[PDB]
Structure 1
């Protein structure tokens, strides 16, 4: 989908509603309500919430 981000730091979360990820991971953004975004991992298709300051939007 239109909005793709790359992780800048590891994000570990003990909570099932969060998407945990590794630095350098690519994700699709699904929702930008405030600063906690909903995302899907490009690699696993796993979905959840992410802290938007852990991530950078890229062109294409």
Structure 2
């Protein structure tokens, strides 16, 4: 239960200022890709949209 990839939940509706960031929705979650880093958490939407996301305005969801 640690494929180096989990899901997160956006506490607040964070918007993207460029293809670099990923638009987040309140209550919604995304696919965590690069969690090892620390500067910025990389997330991916089920639509194939990825971008840097603030790990601060969100929390880990873990599998199951």
TM range (shorter): 0.7 to 0.9
Q: When you count strand as a share of all residues, which structure comes out higher?
A: 1
- Counterpart position of 2:32: 29
TM-score normalised by length of structure 1: 0.81
Q: Which runs of no fewer than 5 residues in structure 2 stay unpaired?
A: none
Aligned residues: 59
Q: Within 5 Å, give how 1:47-58 maps onto structure 2.
A: 47-58=50-61
TM-score normalised by length of structure 2: 0.77
Runs of 4 or more, structure 1, over 6 Å off, are none
- Counterpart position of 1:15: 18
Q: Which runs of no fewer than 5 residues in structure 1 stay unpaired?
A: none
